[PDB]
Design a protein around this ligand. Structure first.
Ligand SMILES: C[C@@H]1COCCN1c1cc(N2CCOC[C@@H]2C)nc2nc(-c3ccccn3)[nH]c12
Lengths: 970, 264
């Protein structure tokens, strides 16, 4: 299993300087050898065999070179140590013993599987034990996606290999926004190539900038202009235009970089080598027998009885009324009751699922009896081979997620709980003298073939948001004109909601429409991948939309949600996972975050097997980046062990003692080798060179986070950044703030495209495990309280910092930063802000930290049905925006500030479909603030989607006035 | 009669409040509210474990689900389909308006007319709710910590099992290689070498006995912690129903306080 901790031995976070190691020689003798904690295996094996001569039977031992060490790791694996250059303290030994054996088997294969198992955080050999045929078929069948990528990666000789390692970080469109283009001089830009300054067009290709010299690279990082994209379309150049920065670039020879490409080679693994009645033929109703359960955890006096709640679901919607079993006492969980459902079997859709749970009923207060779910479990009615389930089945149930109050959990994952020390419910499906299977699409397409006022409605229904109300009349109206909807393709989601999914007649027809349905925009296809659209044909159409029109930067921008929706898939082998794996294997910038998003949830047993199999297929084909990923993993593992020591055994010591311990440990050889010279997980284009120990320090806070500082080893590191600072957090769940920063980054993208330079600083934030993550440290930033350590204090600090002509630049940045944050926080409902949640840079850039909760998180604690204004511009912030002018609300600067907020609020409102769908794709993520579609209703109110666009602006203006106590006017 | 005095009319409630009022209700349960757009009337019906929205259009004091708008009042429109099926309107919906959700029962929770009496009671309930909320959140931490440490211990026990298998393989290995050499030294008279082999074997057996006893102590810890998990799990499955009802009672007293005070 995954490691319990990150220490050097079980129960020991750090080995002593010297330690006794029991060595088991192949002659039966056991030798007790004292080793240095940082000694290598090639040295330990040398001292062991000189000491072995002093013991019996030494003669029948072979040469030192004929043996290697084996031991039990903290993952309970018997790992053979083929790399004898490893240190004793880095072996992750369970106990301090080593066994001597002769190496056997396919050595190169065992070395790869160990490297893959290290990156995964789980030994690859555990997948071989899995009896489930769906798991094994996934491991073998998924390889063709691996083969495809490595083939498309080395067919263009060096070029194709480079585009993989250093893809171009470009926009989705070369069209330049108006406010960005106006910053250019007659449609050209001045660039400095390393000093040889030159002015050239913005539409010019990098090759013609090279011709202007009389491959390119950004100074300070590993970003390369390897494609003929318009120089403006590159994100680095596009950003320099907006911020007015001088684009410092570097030129070099393509052979100087092509030599550093390692000719990635993929090798087929070992597991690659080593009557049916139609569903429409069945003529009976659907019935399931709830046989028995083993136990439930609840005391007999505080709960009356228990029962099993079942229901047939198609995504989030039930296909028929839920059916409960009889109520039995807690001690006798036995039913053996054939539950009958109001659904005809041939009408069961392909994605039909059974959702059940063991509930506790306690009727002891008035007539209202409380029902609480104790455990839950979901089962696909059709397996991955289109086979309807039959016979008896045992299912181990999951704990109810925190905050879930519903009696069933259809959003949850299907399959049994791998933890067998849980309640187990035995079921029994009926049989029809043969196997039952879903009919093939060709053998069903025959079943389907077997005005103006209306145009104004259909168009208006497609403009609605994905969560807007849909009456039954509008469903019949949509179903009646389902053939005229092809002219308005964007209406498909609303149309699919109008289908009677518990009817084979209507489902078959809808299949023929999506088969020849024109592709929709990617941002609209992502909706078809959430928990509301489970059908394979529907999800296949969505995948094909992404395959044709989803650019790599939008894929990287939406990667979080696209990974989360993998949990909704019924089966391991689906088109979505093949598409995502392919892109991860053809773009390393995508693969890097693909790996870390999966790795960060390997602790979650609901998805560890799915994400573990996907990670195996990826690491097995990602080429030489597996080496760099392992370097990142072991770096994080030592930071986890360090912070675990500080917050466990040394939690009752002063910072003077802890820092002395920190600088002592960080100076060790094993620690410097692991935490120096590797790529930053926040951005693999950033090289984390050597540590600046004088800047590293334990943060004086309760959670004891660590601020770390690395040198940027890039030759031209002075042009961009010389210090690379990151905060390492171990204890706080950062998924919510990773999501919030992503949404804010998406909001800024919408504003820049609509010609609104509401500059935001979306610093990096990445969750790498359970309550462990990294956060990019913004340089030169101080909290508003730190600035105050008077109303003009904040304004004088920006005056003292930026003086003269720099004053106007800073005030503009502070004002444009409030516009974005003011609008984004109100829309999302971020936790209330204060002088510690808000920070400012020396240049005026505003930075909010620790967003925390979002949406109506206070409605449950305090039942106040009101939309909050989390960021209220105090008098301090209004003075800065007004350039020090009293009557700040009446200033021309404040009028332009309101115009930004108004335009930004409407801008996000106009793209509300994208944001509703993004949250909808996170409903199964596990964030208690985002569990049901009713939690997403908060942004439908803040964006005023049920009102006209003018009413929404009036609503936003009212919220701002009621929070700032007047001053907002139009 | 008026629509305001009708029980199944709720005025300005959201779709989410309707969902909770119709959660797990039997087919036929219904209620009428104003439009979210704010026909100005939406009928919500329970059917097949879903909540079907049926819009009530209004043209020139005439009401109906579709034109021709036959009915003249929402009350007459509701009562008619309370006694006849909806299949005559649309065949997909083959049910009647049978079980009404009344605003009368919602007024039964609060039992105090005085605004000072409701406010005083609201403060009591909201105080209890925060007490039980902080209690629940503390139990959840112990629940998560215990669950994680139980998983850690079980993995360690798996590691103990594999370690013991390796050390027991050493004994068999030493037994195989010895005996052959033990017999030779016996004829060769080298009794000192027999004792060195016997001493190393005793050294291996004692280490094995210690590892076995370390696994037994860990298994005893796992047994105790697994029992503590079941007890924490029970204490949470008991306060979860009480915390829900306590929050809903708190929310209703808030509803009573808002409706009884000045509004915009
Ligand atoms: C990375 C951020 C932004 O760049 C500046 C440094 N930095 C932070 C400084 C920061 N402190 C500065 C003021 O003194 C208190 C503390 C040492 N407290 C942060 N809490 C978080 C954070 C963010 C997301 C989720 C959870 N916690 N980030 C923080």
């Amino acid at each position: 299993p995954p490691r319990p901790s990150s220490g050097e031995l079980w129960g020991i976070h750090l080995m002593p300087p010297r330690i006794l190691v029991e060595c088991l020689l192949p002659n039966g003798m056991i030798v007790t050898l004292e080793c240095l904690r940082e000694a290598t295996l090639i040295t330990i094996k040398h001292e062991l065999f000189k000491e072995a001569r002093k013991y019996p039977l030494h003669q029948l031992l072979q040469d030192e070179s004929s043996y290697i060490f084996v031991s039990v790791t903290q993952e309970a694996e018997r790992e053979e140590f083929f790399d004898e250059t490893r240190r004793l303290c880095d072996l992750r030994l369970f106990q301090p013993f080593l066994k001597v054996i002769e190496p056997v088997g396919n050595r190169e294969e065992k070395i790869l599987n160990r490297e893959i198992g290290f990156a995964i955080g789980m030994p690859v050999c555990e997948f071989d034990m899995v009896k489930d045929p769906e798991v094994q078929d996934f491991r073998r069948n998924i390889l063709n996606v691996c083969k495809e990528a490595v083939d498309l990666r080395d067919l263009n000789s060096p070029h194709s290999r480079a585009m993989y390692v250093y893809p171009p970080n470009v926009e989705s469109s070369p069209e330049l926004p108006k406010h960005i283009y106006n910053k250019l001089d007659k449609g050209q830009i001045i660039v400095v190539i390393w000093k040889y300054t030159l002015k050239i067009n913005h539409d010019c290709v990098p090759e013609q900038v090279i011709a202007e010299a009389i491959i390119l690279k950004v100074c300070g990082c590993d970003e390369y202009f390897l494609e003929k994209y318009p120089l403006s379309q590159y994100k680095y150049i596009r950003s320099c235009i907006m911020l007015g920065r001088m684009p410092n670039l570097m030129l070099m020879a393509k052979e100087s970089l092509y030599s550093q490409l390692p000719m990635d080679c993929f090798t087929m693994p070992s597991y690659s080598r080593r009557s049916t009645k139609s569903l429409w033929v069945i003529n009976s109703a659907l019935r399931i027998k709830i046989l028995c359960a083993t136990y439930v955890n609840v005391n007999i006096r505080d709960i009356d009885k228990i029962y099993v709640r079942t229901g047939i679901y198609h995504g989030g919607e039930p296909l028929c009324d839920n059916v409960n079993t009889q109520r039995v006492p807690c001690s006798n969980p036995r039913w053996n009751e054939w539950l009958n459902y109001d659904i005809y079997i041939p009408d069961l859709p392909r994605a039909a699922r059974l959702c059940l749970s063991i509930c506790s009923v306690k009727g002891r207060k008035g007539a209202k009896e409380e029902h609480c779910p104790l455990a839950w479990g979901n089962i696909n009615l059709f397996d991955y081979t289109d086979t309807l389930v039959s016979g008896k089945m045992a299912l181990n149930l999951w704990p109810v997620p925190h905050g879930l109050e519903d009696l069933l959990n259809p959003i949850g994952v299907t399959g049994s709980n791998p933890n067998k020390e849980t309640p187990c419910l035995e079921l029994e499906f009926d049989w029809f003298s043969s196997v039952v299977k879903f009919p093939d699409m060709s053998v069903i397409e025959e079943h389907a073939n077997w005005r103006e006022n209306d145009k104004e409605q259909l168009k208006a229904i497609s403009t609605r948001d994905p969560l807007s109300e849909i009456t039954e009349q509008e469903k019949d109206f949509l179903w009646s004109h389902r053939h005229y909807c092809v002219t308005i393709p964007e209406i498909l989601p609303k149309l699919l909601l109008s289908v009677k999914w518990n009817s084979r007649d209507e489902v078959a027809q809808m299949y023929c429409l999506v088969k020849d349905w024109p592709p929709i925009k990617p941002e609209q296809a992502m909706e078809l991948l959430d928990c509301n659209y489970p059908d394979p044909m529907v999800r296949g159409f969505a995948v094909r939309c992404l395959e044709k029109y989803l650019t790599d930067d939008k894929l990287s921008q939406y990667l979080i949600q696209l990974v989360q929706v993998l949990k909704y898939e019924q089966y391991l082998d689906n088109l979505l996972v093949r598409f995502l794996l392919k892109k991860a294997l053809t773009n390393q910038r995508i693969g890097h975050f693909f790996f870390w998003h999966l790795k960060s949830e390997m602790h979650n047993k609901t998805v560890s097997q799915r994400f573990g199999l996907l990670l195996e297929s990826y690491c097995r084909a990602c080429g030489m980046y597996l080496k760099h990923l392992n370097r990142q993993v072991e770096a994080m593992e030592k930071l986890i062990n360090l912070t675990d020591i500080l917050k466990q055994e040394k939690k009752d010591e002063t910072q003077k003692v802890q820092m002395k311990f920190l600088v002592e440990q960080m100076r060790r050889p094993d620690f410097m080798d692991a935490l120096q010279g590797f790529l930053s997980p926040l951005n693999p284009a950033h090289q984390l060179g050597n540590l600046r120990l004088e800047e590293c320090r334990i943060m004086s806070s309760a959670k004891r986070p660590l601020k770390l500082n690395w040198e940027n080893p890039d030759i031209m590191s002075e042009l961009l950044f010389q210090n690379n600072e990151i905060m390492f957090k171990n204890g706080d769940d950062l998924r919510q703030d990773m999501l919030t920063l992503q949404i804010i980054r998406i909001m800024e993208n919408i504003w820049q495209n609509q010609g609104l330079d509401l500059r935001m600083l979306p610093y990096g934030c990445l969750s790498i495990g359970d309550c462990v993550g990294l956060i990019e440290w913004v340089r030169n930033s101080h909290t508003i309280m730190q600035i105050q350590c008077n109303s003009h204090t904040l304004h004088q600090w920006l005056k003292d910092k930026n003086k003269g002509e720099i004053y106007d630049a800073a005030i503009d940045l502070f004002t444009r930063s409030c516009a974005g944050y003011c609008v984004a926080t109100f829309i999302l409902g971020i936790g209330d802000r204060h002088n510690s949640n808000i920070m400012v840079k020396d240049d005026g850039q505003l930075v909010h930290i620790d967003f925390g909760h979002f949406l109506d998180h206070k409605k449950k604690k305090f039942g106040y049905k009101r939309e909050r204004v989390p960021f209220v511009l105090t008098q301090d912030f209004l003075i800065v925006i007004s350039k020090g002018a009293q009557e700040c609300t009446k200033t021309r600067e404040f009028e332009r500030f309101q115009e930004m907020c108004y335009k930004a609020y409407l801008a996000i409102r106009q793209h509300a479909n994208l944001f509703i769908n993004l949250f909808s794709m996170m409903l199964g993520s596990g964030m208690p603030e985002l569990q049901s579609f009713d939690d997403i209703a908060y942004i439908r109110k803040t964006l005023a989607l049920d009102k006209t666009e003018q009413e929404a602006l009036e609503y936003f203006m009212k919220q701002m006035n009621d929070a700032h106590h007047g001053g907002w006017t139009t | 009669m008026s629509l305001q005095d009708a029980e199944w009319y709720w005025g300005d409630i959201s779709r989410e409040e309707v969902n909770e009022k119709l959660r797990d209700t039997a087919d036929g349960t219904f209620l009428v509210r104003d439009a979210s757009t704010k026909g100005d009337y939406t009928l919500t019906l329970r059917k097949g474990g879903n909540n079907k929205l049926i819009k009530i259009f209004h043209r020139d004091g005439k009401y109906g689900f579709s034109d021709p708008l036959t009915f003249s009042s929402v009350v007459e429109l509701i009562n008619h389909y309370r006694n006849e099926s909806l299949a005559q309107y649309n065949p997909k919906l083959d049910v009647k308006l049978l079980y009404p959700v009344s605003k009368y029962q919602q007024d039964q929770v609060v039992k105090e007319d005085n605004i000072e009496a409701v406010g005083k009671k609201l403060h009591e309930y909201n105080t209890q709710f925060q007490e039980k909320s902080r209690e629940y959140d503390r139990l959840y931490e112990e629940y998560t910590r215990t669950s994680q440490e139980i998983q850690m211990k079980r993995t360690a026990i798996e590691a103990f099992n594999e370690t013991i298998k390796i050390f027991e393989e050493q004994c068999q290995t030493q037994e195989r290689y010895s005996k052959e050499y033990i017999e030779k030294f016996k004829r060769e008279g080298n009794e000192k070498e027999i004792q060195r082999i016997m001493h190393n074997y005793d050294k291996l057996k004692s280490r094995i006995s210690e590892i076995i006893d370390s696994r037994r102590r860990l298994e005893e810890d796992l047994k105790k912690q697994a029992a503590e998990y079941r007890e924490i799990d029970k204490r949470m499955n008991s306060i979860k129903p009480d915390l829900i009802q306590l929050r809903k009672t708190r929310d209703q007293y808030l509803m009573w306080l808002t409706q009884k005070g000045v509004r915009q």
